[PDB]
Design a protein around this ligand. Structure first.
Ligand SMILES: [Mg+2]
Ligand SMILES: [Mg+2]
Ligand SMILES: [Mg+2]
Ligand SMILES: [Mg+2]
Ligand SMILES: [Mg+2]
Ligand SMILES: [Mg+2]
Ligand SMILES: [Mg+2]
Ligand SMILES: [Mg+2]
Ligand SMILES: [Mg+2]
Ligand SMILES: [Mg+2]
Ligand SMILES: [Mg+2]
Ligand SMILES: [Mg+2]
Ligand SMILES: [Zn+2]
Lengths: 107, 124, 96, 242
RNA sequence: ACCGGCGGACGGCUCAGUAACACGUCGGUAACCUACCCUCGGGAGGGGGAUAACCCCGGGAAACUGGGGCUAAUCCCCCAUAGGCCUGGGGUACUGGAAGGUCCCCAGGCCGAAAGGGAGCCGUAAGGCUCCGCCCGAGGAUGGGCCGGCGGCCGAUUAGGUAGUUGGUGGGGUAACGGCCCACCAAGCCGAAGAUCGGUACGGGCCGUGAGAGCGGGAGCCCGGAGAUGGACACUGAGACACGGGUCC
């Protein structure tokens, strides 16, 4: 099945209605890549991405990091340390607005 | 207690005002809105007021009134007390604007010595 | 004064003709509306009752003035279209 | 807008495609909702007063409109707020002239004179297409209008095709497909008002819009958005364009 | 003059509050509302009702306000049909990157339209011929709601902070997604790359100065936000918890 990403679907199926592969959730907007740095809450992960910001006065760079909370479907079940792809969705909780759609490199 | 009477004849559209005081006005102290009372018992030369023959044992019913300060009476409020309530229609409030609500001072159901005007209509 | 016609345009939707003109007059005052109208109606064969002068304008250091006028084929159309102030200012009608 | 819809428009905030003197007055006409959108149309008062010059003031422009002297796509229009947009035909029968509304090389709206015969047709790009009750097809065009076709015809119309329509009768007479070798006229963007032929079509994931490569007459290739490319012919234009 | 319709939520004024998704910018709504306007497809059958104005009599110092009589509508209320919404079982006609969406057929329910009204001529009359209008459905347009990433102050003589707090499951409520609010189950969430707390302040386009790198400001015009003596809360309406409308302290 395709959801417009162009990536392979997960190995097995799930019953989560909040899953974009086997449920009714839709993805639309930005797609980010990052690293998991926390997986304690049920079906929730924290994803961190690094980037450089340019300081015009000092003509030099500094490193900044972006942290995003995302929903973790049971068929994927990402864990701390691996690379993930996440896609934007409709509000799911107070802080959750993305869903994990693929593990790129297991830790 | 002095009552100023407004007698309305529904079969003609004509009304007459007389003043009644003394022992006659004492009986009328205590009746609500919507109850009848014979005019012969109340005591009135009815045939003289309108210049018309009337059937015997005729009677009248209390329809409304105004108090000494100029506030009117409300059929839906019980007792003789005076209140200040929020209104959207009905006696004691002319809206002038869609959905307008205003707080007004109104009177009660039972007749009281403070009441001045009494409006009644003849029931044959 | 010497009058030169610059443009004559036809406006069928309104029912009029619109006339732009110049007046050359070194050493003279700005010409009056009456004189300009008389010269214009002689120069174009117009009924003067339906000839309205929109404006006459002089400039800072010039010997000439520029002017704009309109001519209606029908009096009632003129009374229906034109504002009251311009017809009074041109002496076509009387101020109440 | 603290509590309700806006009904006014300052001259300084007017759309950039109008030919209007932006500092001469405080207010501009706020156009009425209608066929096109705000970025691709202009109120009719500016056509009567500012563009053509048939009236000097708004008051006598309104008297001209109320008598029924101006036709838009073959229909009488009296509202001075009526929006007039891309590919419309403006007709004045008492003077016998006709124009097509088209964007400039700089993106501003202008009037292009045309023949009386060509004034009977309006090209309409197919913006959307849907099923409707009774199992029929509704076509939704770029100017906001709609048409119905039977289920047997469903393979002859797709989005981005152009339909030549006879106005004001609203009768179909030709369907022009969107494919390689078709003739297109650009309506928005940096390459606005350029025209040519289709060379290639490209698509992307996750809802990013698709892009087209176009060869012009002098042999140069340029790209634009697919939805900015308005089909006007097979290999020659079917309408007169500057 | 009154009943009735539309407008009075725009426009105008100020910068108190606010360090926040308030503002700038790129995207999203397949999670939403929209009177006036545009196109297309259809509809306008049968009944009932009061009341202002007007006449009789009035009250109150006034602001205001009472009883009886009588009357019309594009005013109001019913019946029918069309239509709308929820759930269960099938079929696969459409758009799209992708269907909890659209379309077709059965089944159990609930809600439920309309003004053929007005004006002018040809009408002996009968009836046409125009103009302005009424209701439903599909789409657009216009005006908004909600969400995300990124960007822009000072203080450590403020170091730990949070307990509907962070996430999950089942519901309610909303135009709509959501700890927005509940019931139940876990221990999460933020922080020396400066949390929390305190100080000051409406944000931007821009403006002053300087060779430039920079430094300082952001009243006047335009776009966005907020407020109507302070603090709370409602009615009507497509849109307000309303500066020249209502309620309490
Ligand atoms: Mg899209
Ligand atoms: Mg107001
Ligand atoms: Mg306001
Ligand atoms: Mg603070
Ligand atoms: Mg934001
Ligand atoms: Mg921030
Ligand atoms: Mg019904
Ligand atoms: Mg729910
Ligand atoms: Mg301040
Ligand atoms: Mg500042
Ligand atoms: Mg000032
Ligand atoms: Mg004050
Ligand atoms: Zn799954």
């Amino acid at each position: 099945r395709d959801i417009g990403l162009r990536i392979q679907p997960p190995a097995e199926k799930c019953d989560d209605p909040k899953c974009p592969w086997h449920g009714h959730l839709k993805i639309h907007g930005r797609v980010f890549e990052g690293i998991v740095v926390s997986d304690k809450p049920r079906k929730t992960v924290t994803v961190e991405r690094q980037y450089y910001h340019y300081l015009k006065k000092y003509e030099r760079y500094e490193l900044r990091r972006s942290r995003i909370h995302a929903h973790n479907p049971p068929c994927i079940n990402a864990k701390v340390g691996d690379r993930v792809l996440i896609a934007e969705t409709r509000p799911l909780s107070k802080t959750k607005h993305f869903v994990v759609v693929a593990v790129l490199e297991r830790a | 207690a002095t009552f100023k009477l407004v007698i309305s004849d529904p079969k003609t559209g004509i009304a007459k005002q007389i003043e009644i005081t003394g022992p006659e006005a004492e009986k009328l102290i205590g009746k609500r809105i919507g109850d009848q009372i014979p005019v012969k018992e109340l005591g009135i030369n009815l045939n003289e007021l309108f210049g018309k023959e009337f059937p015997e044992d005729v009677k009248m019913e209390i329809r409304g009134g105004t108090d000494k300060d100029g506030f009117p009476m409300r059929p839906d409020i019980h007792g003789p007390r005076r209140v200040r309530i929020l209104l959207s229609k009905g006696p004691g409030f002319r809206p002038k604007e869609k959905g307008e609500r205003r707080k007004k001072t109104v009177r009660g159901n039972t007749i009281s010595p403070e009441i001045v005007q009494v409006n009644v209509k003849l029931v044959y | 004064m010497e009058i030169k016609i610059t443009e004559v345009k036809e406006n069928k939707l309104i029912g009029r003709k619109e006339i732009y003109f110049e007046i050359y007059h070194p050493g003279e005052p700005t010409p009056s509306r009456k004189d300009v109208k008389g010269k214009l109606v002689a120069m174009l064969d117009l009924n003067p009752e339906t000839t309205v002068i929109q404006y006459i304008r002089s400039y800072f250091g010039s010997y000439k003035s520029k002017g704009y006028a309109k001519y209606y084929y029908d009096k009632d159309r003129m009374l229906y279209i034109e504002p009251e102030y311009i017809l009074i200012r041109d002496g076509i009608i009387e101020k109440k | 807008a603290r509590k309700g819809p806006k009904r006014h428009l300052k001259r300084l905030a007017a759309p950039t495609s109008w030919y209007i003197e932006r500092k001469a007055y405080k207010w501009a006409v706020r156009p009425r909702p209608g066929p096109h959108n705000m970025r691709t149309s202009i109120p009719l008062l500016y056509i009567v007063r500012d563009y053509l010059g048939y009236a000097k003031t708004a008051r006598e422009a309104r008297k001209i409109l109320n008598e029924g002297k101006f036709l838009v796509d073959g229909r009488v229009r009296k509202d001075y707020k009526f929006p007039v947009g891309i590919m419309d035909v403006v007709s004045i029968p008492e003077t016998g002239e006709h124009y097509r509304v088209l964007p400039n090389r700089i993106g501003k709206l202008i009037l292009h004179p045309i023949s009386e015969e060509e004034a009977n047709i309006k090209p309409l790009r197919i913006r959307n297409k849907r099923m409707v009750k009774g199992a029929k097809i509704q076509l939704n065009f770029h100017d906001g209008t709609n048409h119905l076709i039977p289920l047997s015809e469903k393979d002859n119309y797709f989005t981005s095709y152009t339909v030549l329509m006879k106005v004001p009768e609203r009768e179909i007479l030709e369907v022009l497909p969107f494919e390689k070798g078709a003739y297109v006229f650009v309506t928005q963007g940096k390459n606005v008002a350029r025209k040519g032929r289709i060379v290639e079509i490209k698509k992307f994931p996750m809802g990013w819009p698709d892009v087209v490569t176009i060869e012009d007459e002098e042999g140069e290739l340029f790209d634009t958005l697919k939805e900015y490319a308005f089909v006007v012919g097979r290999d020659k234009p079917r309408i007169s364009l500057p």
